[PDB]
Amino acid sequence: YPAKPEAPGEDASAEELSRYYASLRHYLNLVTRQRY
């Protein structure tokens, strides 16, 4: 799904989650001043 995706599999620790949660703040900014 768009806007902070969520799909747990068989390879997700308490760290992969921080990497997944700290990615939304980048994807959102990727539509602000900077554009991919």
Provide a short characterization of the protein structure.
The PDB classes it as hormone. 39% of the residues lie in helices and 0% in strands.
Can you describe this structure?
By secondary structure, the protein is mainly alpha-helical. The chain has one helix at residues 16-29. It is elongated, with a radius of gyration of 12 Å. This is Peptide YY.
Write the topology of this structure:
Layout: H1 16-29
Features:
monomer; 1 helix; elongated; Peptide YY; hormone activity; Pancreatic_hormone-like_CS; hormone
Please identify the structural class as seen in this structure: mainly alpha
What distance lies between the first and last C-alpha atoms, to the nearest angstrom? 19 Å
Give the strand content. under 5%
Strand element count: 0
Over the alpha carbons, how many angstroms does the gyration radius reach?
12 Å
Q: Helical content, roughly?
A: 25-40%
So how many helices? 1
Shape: elongated
Note the main sheet: none
Helix-strand sequence: H
PDB class: hormone
Keywords: peptide YY, PYY, neurohormone, folding of helical hairpins, hormone
Assembly: monomeric
Entry title: Structure of Ala14-PYY in aqueous solution
